[PDB]
Design a protein around this ligand. Structure first.
Ligand SMILES: *[C@@H]1O[C@H](CO)[C@@H](O[C@@H]2O[C@H](CO)[C@@H](O)[C@H](O)[C@H]2NC(C)=O)[C@H](O)[C@H]1NC(C)=O
Ligand SMILES: *[C@@H]1O[C@H](CO)[C@@H](O)[C@H](O)[C@H]1NC(C)=O
Ligand SMILES: *[C@@H]1O[C@H](CO)[C@@H](O)[C@H](O)[C@H]1NC(C)=O
Ligand SMILES: *[C@@H]1O[C@H](CO)[C@@H](O)[C@H](O)[C@H]1NC(C)=O
Ligand SMILES: *[C@@H]1O[C@H](CO)[C@@H](O)[C@H](O)[C@H]1NC(C)=O
Ligand SMILES: [Ba+2]
Ligand SMILES: [Cl-]
Ligand SMILES: [Cl-]
Ligand SMILES: [Cl-]
Lengths: 414, 418, 417
């Protein structure tokens, strides 16, 4: 009777060992991870790259008759028949100018047009200060995006050293006073695809390793306010397969030195436009030929829109394992104060109304001298699995790997 | 002498096995969990439900003499004695209109209902909605569903209720989302001539982005949007998975309420309020769902409001709402630009037959979108399972004395024989 | 032949046991942690402390002839030669006041104190606070406690100091929190007639929401609020628990500061600054606490500012502040509505005896509240404790060779012979 209960105990015990052991086996083969949050204090933080565009693509005073002829339909100033839109709510001077530029009696490169006709940082930048020291417009690098001629501070490209800040708070960062030049905005007399009612700027704070994608990743800043942007640096570490989904091999594209999800997106877009239309848009990089305004209308735009809708699987961009992101909180104060409106108006030779409708101050800084780290960490390593299987194997039947080998011997002999 | 060193080694080893084993056992009965954060890319994201209210509860031009009679004291337009309060800063025309509506001489009171009053006197979306765009294509006011909240007649875009299928977005960024130009109609706001608790100085709208599975709770979970700016809202979809007891505190059971199909903490709160008011005052407020009779303004004054305040103050034990295990939250970042530009002010004023002053002080543009086509997942994960517990106890039990459950069974064998 | 294959199995098994065992040992000695996020519903929340400053440091109408004499150069009202700068784009009356105040002819100076000057010249809460409400009941200016910061005379609601009990809120949403209507008094702002480093063009207030256990740090940790809007601030209470060494880097000890009862990273920062300024310049600025003598504007000019700037870069290793293990933080989301409505603009103008222009450029309403009655917890949790190490080592030690600590002790016993 004792040997019978002993045998049943060995059978049931081996069953428990079976289900527990297979439990840990399957759990290990889920390849699970868990998240580790940490906050790291530092004596220094590398200041990010800040790209901003004016919401107005190009200045009205810099457009010429040839530009109206070639790109008049694309810029939405002229119709398909090369005629002025509805004369409702048209400035007399503006309408006379446009009719004169559209004489088209006895009368082009897209990047020339954007580079020359776009808003000049030398006129927009009323003041610049970085860590309390003056900066020049030469510090901003020209980048061409969907919004037109845009500028990036602390771009760190072409070998320029990335800036550091050794103090946190509103004073110790980038601080620019900009004039959005609302008088240069395209007159809107009729509904158009490009028609916009907004006035202000659009900003993206990003690491120097990734290109700007300001039409998607940007936030707005309105004139008449000083907006503060508190940034918090975040360092993210992901896991490759089979744990997570990250790109272990960087596989950097020829266009950009460092791989980024954004750079992969605009690379896919450029390649698609080159394949379908044999030309590239203004924002796209490389040495490829730029599109003509006729090419824009009949090929480029429908190809991009069709690329978004028709085949979303075609452009699959994996996320890199090391990603530096910047968190940001916005707040505003009124500019200018009643005590300062007169001095600004006289300093920049403008009316007090103009200052009210055209001046914005951007204040970008790190809240404190620290950065957060978010790391995906493996939850079950092979040592832990062998340890658990060994522990349960020794608790339930007390066997070992040598024991199973010896059982194969005794079974083999008999 | 060797048997003494063996006895000491076995005793100390058995003690260490005791405290370490009880350590791992107690850790298991804490039922600990740790968090797994992940970011998942998707080719499509279901666009959320967007509820917005005007900060002004009802339009001044739509209020009638009967409304002043029944709900005049509640609407704060008339005093307790059915007479107009202090006329400070009163436009002659507006004050004459109100004085005419409050004549109450040989007046036969018509029947009055709170939901009728809010439904007709509230701001009409057909008048507020100057333009709507979703994914670059036009939307109708028919996409907006009428929802009654504490703020009055409010509207929910993409509510996904009453059999309408929920909208999706296949691209991220400012263009590819909801974008509505609204006229808040500041001319219809109730005149404020005397100070009161209900008096407010704000002008604009209030918006809540929420899942279609939960009803709006705009008085608590909404953010404000001011006229004169285009406000961008970047959203990040978050999928949360919690653990039930004894690991965490979540609602494991579906717990369907009579009022709402899917369980949500918001639905649990407004359900608790509805039940409390129905039992205490035998009437229901405007925002509450069900089939109960709505309160009369007398019931509002003498029962409903003090009943809700007393429910909030006396004890939270009556309404204890646990969070469901599967929760979809939407994160949002706000930014602003000025509207309209000088190049557009005249065109807007002429397009909607208003003065440029009016456009400047009444037009707001709301742009709601997903920053990118991905969603975050936050999952509570169990940290110590019974297989791992048995593995650790077996490992240490085998390390210190090298015994097994069969070994302890044999020692109990000799104990039974003894 | 059987003993040879057995020997190969025992050798490979002992090698694998070696590398796996050293693996778990090294993983334990990394002292790793992982994070536990949780959300807890609550019936009550302790309302935080709210500090706000006017962006204008001191009122122009309260500055006196003696103040101009001693601190005229420091306040940027007077030039290096104690003379008014260029009068370009200066209102005739506005400049007349200053020219009369800066006469300095047959003027017999009187004693001067920087903290008296800020306390008397700063914006008075009794004039700024147009209305106050907490949980729907009225509050007085006496509820705000005076704190001196780099921005000047500032105020803290629900400071919980001097024996006052901390306030709680039992409901979430816009109504059920602090709600103040403020007049920033833009007419009292310092005139800006000439370019200077100290010149600023902003108008408004700056707010910091913080725990009562920490002093404000508004020059670094504050956000702005603009006039002409009601700004809603939704707060989310976060409770954080960190690990001390060797797992993480937190304050294991109480860390008693001389100036503050409770330790906070901010209190550590202003402590480092105050001590440094007392050692190098023998005086403290207005914002600094303690019992040292306050600096004179000459001391400010020739010692204090360059000493602080030298402290930032040269001694960046010198001020190291460790983070406390238990920290209550408040997260915030900002949104705005327009104030006043056309239906209320004139009523406000007559209620406060001001023009509608003034109301438009001077009135702001701040609405601070909890989004919901819950709090998040973020805890660093030890990932590998010694019990788990011993369990894993025993499991693998028993799987590969089937040995125990008694087995190795017996092997050393036989080796002893
Ligand atoms: C909560 O969400 C999870 C998925 O995130 C649901 O789990 C799925 O349940 C269905 C059954 O209806 C299975 O077919 C799927 O395979 C499950 N997915 C996973 C990943 O396990 C879960 O059912 C949801 N819970 C509730 C109450 O809705
Ligand atoms: C990624 O970043 C971490 C710091 O966050 C660094 O230690 C590591 O070397 C980087 N590279 C890789 C491949 O992890
Ligand atoms: C100042 O503005 C006026 C008005 O346009 C202009 O005529 C004048 O040239 C400007 N002065 C300078 C120095 O540019
Ligand atoms: C514009 O509105 C006013 C207000 O009543 C009306 O009198 C006028 O006829 C309207 N104009 C047009 C063109 O509809
Ligand atoms: C209102 O202010 C004016 C000056 O602006 C003053 O003359 C008048 O006495 C004030 N009235 C009251 C009641 O304070
Ligand atoms: Ba020195
Ligand atoms: Cl998992
Ligand atoms: Cl736990
Ligand atoms: Cl580690």
């Amino acid at each position: 009777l004792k040997r019978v209960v002993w045998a049943l105990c060995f059978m049931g015990s081996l069953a428990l060992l079976a289900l527990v052991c297979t439990n840990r086996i399957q759990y290990y083969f889920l390849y699970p991870h868990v998240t580790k949050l940490d906050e790291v204090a530092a004596t220094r933080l590398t200041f990010p790259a800040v790209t901003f565009c004016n919401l107005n693509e190009f200045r009205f005073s810099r457009v010429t008759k040839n530009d109206l002829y070639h790109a008049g339909e694309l810029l939405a100033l002229l119709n398909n028949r090369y005629e002025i839109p509805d004369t409702q709510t048209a400035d007399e001077k503006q309408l006379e100018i446009l009719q004169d530029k559209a004489n088209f009696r006895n009368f082009f490169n897209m990047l020339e047009f954007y580079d020359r006709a776009g808003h000049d940082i030398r006129e927009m930048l009323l003041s610049c200060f970085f860590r309390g020291e003056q900066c020049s417009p030469e510090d901003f690098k020209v980048v061409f995006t969907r919004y037109g001629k845009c500028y990036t501070f602390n771009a760190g490209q072409d070998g320029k050293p990335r800036l550091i800040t050794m103090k946190g708070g509103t004073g110790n960062g980038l601080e620019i006073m900009l004039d959005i030049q609302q008088d240069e905005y395209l007159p809107v007399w009729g509904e158009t695809d490009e028609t916009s009612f907004e006035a202000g700027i659009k900003v993206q704070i990003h690491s120097q390793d990734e290109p700007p994608l300001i039409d998607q990743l940007g936030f707005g800043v309105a004139p008449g306010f000083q907006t503060f942007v508190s940034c918090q640096e975040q360092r993210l570490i992901y896991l490759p397969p089979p744990w997570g989904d990250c790109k272990a091999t960087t596989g950097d594209s020829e266009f950009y030195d460092t791989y980024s999800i954004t750079a992969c997106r605009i690379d896919c877009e450029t390649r698609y436009l080159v394949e379908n239309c044999n030309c590239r848009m203004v924002h796209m990089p490389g040495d490829a030929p730029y599109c003509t305004p006729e090419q824009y209308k009949e090929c480029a735009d429908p190809a991009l829109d069709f690329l978004v809708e028709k085949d979303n699987e075609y452009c699959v961009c994996e996320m890199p394992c090391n990603v530096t992101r910047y968190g940001k909180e916005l707040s505003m104060v009124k500019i200018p104060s009643k005590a300062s409106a007169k001095y600004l108006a006289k300093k920049y030779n403008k009316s007090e109304q103009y200052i009210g409708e055209n001046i914005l101050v951007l204040d970008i800084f790190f809240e404190a001298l620290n950065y957060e780290t978010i790391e995906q960490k493996k939850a079950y390593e092979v040592a832990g699995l062998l340890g658990d299987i060994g522990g349960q194997m020794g608790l339930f039947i007390g066997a070992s790997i040598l024991t199973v080998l010896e059982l194969f011997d005794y079974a083999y002999e008999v």
